[PDB]
């Protein structure tokens, strides 16, 4: 049972904690926590490639894409590894994240420890938008809060 954690901070007021857990190797990952300070609605949720926050959330680079694929919702098969789709913030701007994904891992070639979790401005269109940008970033808009994923 490997655990991991991330603390999301930004320039704006957005901030939260997201925990990872992976019972079995190369198994599935439980991802859970709470982001507060969001605009009510949907927000793109991504693991970007680098754990670099020197120029803030910009340094995180692109979505984690070790297999060199196009963008997609987490349920699709054409997807980046760090493409986790969208989180929902309520009338109080709090998103209670509760995901379970089976592509990202805490170990091996798909390991995200040392990479950056990022909550985005708008909503990820899951690649179904119909312009070149939707197949890369998914038009999730700019980056609101980020953090390096560390070990627990």
């Amino acid at each position, epitope marked *: 049972a490997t655990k991991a954690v991330c603390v999301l901070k930004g320039d*704006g*007021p*957005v*901030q939260g904690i997201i925990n990872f857990e992976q019972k079995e190797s190369n198994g599935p990952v439980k991802v859970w926590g709470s982001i*507060k*300070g*969001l*605009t*009510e609605g949907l927000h793109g949720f991504h693991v970007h490639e680098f754990g670099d926050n020197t120029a803030g959330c910009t340094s995180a680079g692109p979505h984690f894409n070790p297999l060199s694929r196009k963008h997609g919702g987490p349920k699709d098969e054409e997807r980046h590894v760090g493409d986790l789709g969208n989180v929902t*913030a*309520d*009338k*109080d*701007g709090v998103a209670d994240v509760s995901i379970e994904d089976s592509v990202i891992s805490l170990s091996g070639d798909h390991c995200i420890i040392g990479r950056t979790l990022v909550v985005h*401005e708008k909503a990820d269109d899951l690649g179904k938008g119909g312009n070149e940008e939707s197949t890369k970033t998914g038009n999730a808009g700019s980056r*609101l809060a980020c953090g390096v994923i560390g070990i627990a």
Partner: nanobody
Amino acid sequence: SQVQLQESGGGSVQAGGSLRLACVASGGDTRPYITYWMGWYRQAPGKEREGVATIYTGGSGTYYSDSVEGRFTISQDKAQRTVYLQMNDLKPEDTAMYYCAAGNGALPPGRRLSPQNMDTWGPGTQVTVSS
């Protein structure tokens, strides 16, 4: 550069009357994803600031204090950068100075209507209810 709040609309009114306070925000970071917990606070002479209602700038969540629950209603025009307070069925006990204040959008439950966790304040407007 800094956010600044200005109240308006207090005055004198008869027990049972209505008032609609409004606070308009000026300057500061105008970008939509900068959420605050805009709130109305109430200080009577010789007592402590109370805080009667708050609203999320990011969404629509509203929380009221138990002493004004049925009577006060806090609304907002995010595009006009305004937050309103319809106080009706006014008691004599509601006489006080009414301040509008802003605070971090990420404040957790329990710290959203506390004036200590509040960042910038408006100067105040006086509301007096006669009986």
